[PDB]
Amino acid sequence: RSQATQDLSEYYNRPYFDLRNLSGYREGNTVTFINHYQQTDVKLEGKDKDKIKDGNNENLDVFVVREGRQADNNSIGGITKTNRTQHIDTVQNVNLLVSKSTGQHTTSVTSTNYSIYKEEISLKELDFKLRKHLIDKHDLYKTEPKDSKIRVTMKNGDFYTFELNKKLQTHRMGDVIDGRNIEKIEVNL
């Protein structure tokens, strides 16, 4: 197991927090959220920079992963608009198809339902949760990942690709999509 794959395994096994309906204060390219447990400094490194207002921003969700450098609570992207109404049921049910080739002659497919609970969702959150799922259920990063990818397809045919042999690019972590319009998620291992 390369150091590279070891490092991916370490990163995607880190704790994450899903914080809901908080205020974020923007100064420069950092947005500070505080609750009763933690303070998080969220770095804007992409087109999120054009969306978050200078100063106070209300009613945001944040998907938090602490990046590696001491006593830091730095995270990157992961900011969304909170749900406009309460959803007790899932916002959307999505077919997740994980395909795995083993040896020379075997294909295997796991087909489940993937629960979307948020009207708007960051690529950060999709990427991190799906990889953690694959670590947990499909032995991701036990072997070299090679050309392994996730693809998220929207109802209109738009799609987003996460290549599993590197981290998600930091400029993509603050990109957001409409959870209602996700159609399916396919993974090729």
Ligand X SMILES: CO[C@@H]1O[C@H](CO)[C@H](O)[C@@H]2COC(C)(C)O[C@@H]12
Closer by beta carbon to ligand SIA, 26 or else 172? 172
Give residue 182's region: left, alpha or beta (phi > 0; psi -120 to 50): beta
The CB density around residue 112, as the number of other CB atoms within 10 Å, is 13
Tell which one of 15, 89, 104, 147 touches Zn ion (CB under 5 A).
89
Closer by beta carbon to ligand SIA, 46 or else 145? 46
Binding status of residue 85 toward Zn ion by CB under 5 A: no
Q: Cβ(149)–Cβ(166) under 8 Å?
A: no
89 makes contact, choosing from Zn ion, ligand X, ligand SIA, none, with CB < 5 to 8 Å by partner type, with Zn ion
Binding status of residue 161 toward ligand X by CB under 6 A: yes
**Residue 105 beta carbon to ligand SIA: minimum distance, rounded to whole angstroms:** 30
- Tell me the H-state helices in the chain: 3-12, 123-138
163 makes contact, choosing from ligand X, Zn ion, ligand SIA, none, with CB < 5 to 8 Å by partner type, with ligand X
Closest CA to 61 of 106, 116, 118: 118
